Amino acid sequence: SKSKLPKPVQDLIKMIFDVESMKKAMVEYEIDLQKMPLGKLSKRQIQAAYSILSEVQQAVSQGSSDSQILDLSNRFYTLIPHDFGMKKPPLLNNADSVQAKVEMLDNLLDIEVAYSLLRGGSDDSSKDPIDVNYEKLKTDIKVVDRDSEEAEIIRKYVKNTHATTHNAYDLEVIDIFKIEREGECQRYKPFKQLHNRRLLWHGSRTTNFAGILSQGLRIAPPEAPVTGYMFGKGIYFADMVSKSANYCHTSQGDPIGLILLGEVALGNMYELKHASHISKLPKGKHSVKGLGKTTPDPSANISLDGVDVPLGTGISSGVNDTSLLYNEYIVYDIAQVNLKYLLKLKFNFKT
Numbered sequence: 001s002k003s004k005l006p007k008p009v010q011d012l013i014k015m016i017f018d019v020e021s022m023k024k025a026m027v028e029y030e031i032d033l034q035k036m037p038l039g040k041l042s043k044r045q046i047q048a049a050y051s052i053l054s055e056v057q058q059a060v061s062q063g064s065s066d067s068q069i070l071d072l073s074n075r076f077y078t079l080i081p082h083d084f085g086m087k088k089p090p091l092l093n094n095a096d097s098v099q100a101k102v103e104m105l106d107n108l109l110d111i112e113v114a115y116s117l118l119r120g121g122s123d124d125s126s127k128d129p130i131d132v133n134y135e136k137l138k139t140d141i142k143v144v145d146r147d148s149e150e151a152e153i154i155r156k157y158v159k160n161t162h163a164t165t166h167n168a169y170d171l172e173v174i175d176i177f178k179i180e181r182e183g184e185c186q187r188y189k190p191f192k193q194l195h196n197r198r199l200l201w202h203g204s205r206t207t208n209f210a211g212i213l214s215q216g217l218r219i220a221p222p223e224a225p226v227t228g229y230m231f232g233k234g235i236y237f238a239d240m241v242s243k244s245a246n247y248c249h250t251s252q253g254d255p256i257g258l259i260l261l262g263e264v265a266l267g268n269m270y271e272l273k274h275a276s277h278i279s280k281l282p283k284g285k286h287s288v289k290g291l292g293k294t295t296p297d298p299s300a301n302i303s304l305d306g307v308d309v310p311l312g313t314g315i316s317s318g319v320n321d322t323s324l325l326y327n328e329y330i331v332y333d334i335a336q337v338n339l340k341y342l343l344k345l346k347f348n349f350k351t
């Protein structure tokens with residue numbers, strides 16, 4: 001049998017479960033596909049390299065010698081085979097060297113989630129593989145009509161929050177999906193009535209969406225170093241579409257990406273101007289608002305199904321000495337997010 005699902009839904013299911021895209025991401029990460037193939041990828045190996053990556057960071061900012069650093073850098077490449085042939089692996093002597101590797105392991109974990117959904121389960125050639133894979137996501141995906149309503153808010157949000165400093169590409173909304181993860185509304189119940197509930201952006205590689213749609217937006221594991229992130233381990237969001245879009249890691253050789261819209265219950269925000277590698281929020285706070293120089297016009301804030309949408313054009317926030325050009329929002333409890341929409345975007349590069 002053939003799939004009765006709409007074509008935009010089918011193309012989304014093909015895109016996210018692409019085994020060759022998963023392999024392509026792993027080569028970009030310099031991983032030896034002979035010693036660490038796609039099917040031989042494991043959660044406990046990634047957890048183990050995270051612990052050694054925490055040990056590298058523990059020594060980089062503790063002013064350790066380049067010889068004490070080397071031993072720890074080499075130990076990381078032992079647990080995660082990198083394809084460098086018979087050459088010594090690049091040394092991980094700086095802070096950005098480590099964050100890149102902590103980000104690689106976050107993306108490797110969700111590739112394992114995607115592949116394990118696919119490789120697990122049952123084999124039946126009479127069923128359409130697109131219909132099979134869609135069911136694995138345990139999510140209801142519906143196409144949002146362009147002549148609606150909610151599609152005009154979403155399109156306004158995209159058109160109005162593209163920053164001038166992200167002018168190397170333009171965006172085109174290909175398809176707008178309304179998404180409903182099974183059990184999410186119920187997980188959201190303690191936060192459904194909270195104050196400061198906002199419709200915010202979240203960008204990610206297309207290789208993480210089988211795990212995002214199946215498991216929801218998650219926080220990094222305990223093995224991951226908190227210093228490997230600006231505001232520690234939480235779920236990050238932007239009010240500027242282009243800030244999140246930059247996280248799609250789309251290029252000229254891959255201009256199609258996916259971005260999420262989620263209802264985030266922020267409540268009592270712990271405003272910050274500079275990096276803070278927090279483990280937990282201060283008493284009484286529910287989120288971190290990283291204050292940026294530019295912010296969407298607060299007078300232009302709209303309401304979509306009781307949630308505030310910050311779709312105004314960017315203006316000066318009035319924030320003094322801040323490390324951020326634009327805002328970011330971090331929640332440290334997965335239950336504080338309700339994924340509403342999923343967009344397919346075409347990145348039109350000017351570069």
Ligand SMILES: C[C@]1(c2nc3cccc(C(N)=O)c3[nH]2)CCCN1
Binds near residue numbers: 202204229243328
């Ligand atoms: C740097 C980091 C991040 N900062 C963000 C700020 C706004 C939006 C996003 C997003 N993904 O849409 C961000 N992601 C920390 C967690 C992994 N990536």
